[PDB]
Amino acid sequence: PRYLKGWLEDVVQLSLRRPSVRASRQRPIISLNERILEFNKRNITAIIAEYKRKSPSGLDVERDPIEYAKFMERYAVGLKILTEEKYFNGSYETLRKIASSVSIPIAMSDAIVKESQIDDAYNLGADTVVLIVKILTERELESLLEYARSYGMEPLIVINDENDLDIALRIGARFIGIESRDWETLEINKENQRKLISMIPSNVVKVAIAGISERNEIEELRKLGVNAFLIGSSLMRNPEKIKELIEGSLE
Known part of the structure; x- marks a missing residue:
């Protein structure tokens, strides 16, 4: 409910009409941000792996999501599951099945614009949600953050520019994702x-999002203060690439 245009305008309107669920969940929240800090203290590279059937920035991958999630349980600090339907071909049922199969932190990612979507994430088994500042007004962002916290979740608040960063800090974000990808144009800017x-x-x-493909980048970014890394497409196509990113290579 910012002023938007193009596909972002479309996905927001679509999300406003996303039916809520009546699935049930009671198990404790497993903090993603806390496990990241844990990994930092154990000197273990913290990589959040993404599951996304498709996206505006890639090709559709049809793989078994459970098989993928269970493999990632061995390496990833957490998982990010794209549930947006139109542009990411996602589903609440995929999130539900994955959450019921693995024991690492799970973050639901979608165009979250209404409180029922947060209810949905909790009810489906997610440990937290990803809020995109680019599509939300300051008022909605703070309200959704306050709401998520009432469930015991600490949302990953994603920004890609300075003004949006200020807004994130201003509303008290403690878990921030820094996007190298402008979702409006799909262009990447690492500088x-x-x-x-x-x-x-x-x-x-701090979570560096997008554009991460080799361990050198990871090490550089760690020294700059980055706590975790969100990697999607590269892993969705070749899951085992995560081994090198965490353990290094024999060359």
Whole structure:
């Protein structure tokens, strides 16, 4: 409910009409941001793996989601599951099945614009949600953050520019994702990403999103203060690429 155009305008209107669910969940929330800090202290590279059937920035991959999630349970600090229907071909049922099969933190990612979507994430088994600042007004973002926290979740608040970063800090975000991808244009800008990272308080748990493909980048970014890395497409196509990213290579 910011002023939007193109596909982002369309996905927001679509999400406003997303039917809520009556699935049930009671198990404790497994904090994603806390496990990231845990990994940092154990000196283990923290990679959040994404499950997405398709996306505006890639090709459709039809693989068994459970098989994928269980493999990732061995390496990833957490999972991000895309549930948006039109542009990511996602489903609440996929999130539900994955959450019921693995024991690592799960983050539901969608165009979250209404509180029932947060109810949905909790009811389906997600441990947290991903809020996109680019599509929300300051008022909606703060309200959704306050709402998510009432469930015991600490949302990953995603930004890709300075003004949106300020808004995230201003509303009290403690878990921020810095996007190198502008979802409006799909262009990648790593210089901007690093500039934004340098501007974030050290207490914030920082997740570098997109554009990560080799361990060298990871090590560089860690030294710059990044706590975790969100990697999707590369892993959706070749899951075992995560081994090198965490353990290094024999060359």
